[PDB]
Design a binder for this molecule. Structure first.
Ligand SMILES: Nc1nc2c(ncn2[C@@H]2O[C@H](COP(=O)(O)OP(=O)(O)O)[C@@H](O)[C@H]2O)c(=O)[nH]1
Ligand SMILES: Nc1ncnc2c1ncn2[C@@H]1O[C@H](COP(=O)(O)OP(=O)(O)O)[C@@H](O)[C@H]1O
Length: 191
């Protein structure tokens, strides 16, 4: 099977859909634990949700070639390390990655050759509402999210960028569509 890249706007439901997929199919899928320089949100665990490091550690890691890709997003650094992807492969699991649009384009030139899935909100208004209920960003950081989010929604319609686009209105339906898009991936892994 192939690795899986989830991309979409901030708050459209990338994390929520992925977290469920990793519970139902914990034997099939493995999460790529990115590095980030942003502060952990309550409930996030180092080594599970992210590798939480300072900017000095992240830059020294970049200088050492640790990362398949890395991008700056809303004043913080994020990156997919080779070590993170190899950890999933050494477990005999399909690697699932959660990256922004920059990561998608970055990954499009690596040897990962993954499936690309875009998770989109029903409207940009609903996306702002979902981010407000989250309340993990300041209004200065919140405003920057919507600027980057509109670029994601526009690039979702690019002819050869994403393999599957999923509108997250109902989690039951969106996860049902996520499983349907990964049926071939699951079938190959299980054989
Ligand atoms: N390129 C890249 N992007 C990432 C990585 N990890 C996270 N991102 C993206 O950076 C953005 C910041 O996400 P986050 O801080 O968790 O806020 P949230 O997506 O709104 O929950 C998200 O849209 C992720 O898709 C990474 O390792 N590489
Ligand atoms: N289907 C949905 N309907 C309503 N709200 C949602 C839905 N999916 C996610 N949300 C809300 O939006 C936010 C989603 O954040 P997250 O799952 O981290 O998405 P992303 O990883 O794309 O930022 C959460 O605060 C959640 O409460």
């Amino acid at each position: 099977p192939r690795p899986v890249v989830l991309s979409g706007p901030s708050g459209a439901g990338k994390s929520t859909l992925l977290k469920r997929l990793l519970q139902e199919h914990s034997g099939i899928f493995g999460f790529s634990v990115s590095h980030t320089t942003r502060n952990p949100r309550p409930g996030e665990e180092n080594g599970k949700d992210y590798y939480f490091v300072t900017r000095e550690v992240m830059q020294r890691d970049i200088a050492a070639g640790d990362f398949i890709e890395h991008a700056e997003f809303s004043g913080n650094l994020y990156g997919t390390s080779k070590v993170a992807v190899q950890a999933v492969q050494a477990m005999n699991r399909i690697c699932v990655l959660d990256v922004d649009l920059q990561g998608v384009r970055n990954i499009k030139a690596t040897d990962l050759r993954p499936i690309y899935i875009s998770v989109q909100p029903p409207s940009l208004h609903v996306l702002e509402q979902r981010l407000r209920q989250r309340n993990t960003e300041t209004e200065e950081s919140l405003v920057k999210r919507l600027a980057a989010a509109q670029a994601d929604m526009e690039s979702s319609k690019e002819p050869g960028l994403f393999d599957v686009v999923i509108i997250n209105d109902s989690l039951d339906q969106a996860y049902a569509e996520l499983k349907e898009a990964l049926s071939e991936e699951i079938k190959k892994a299980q054989r």
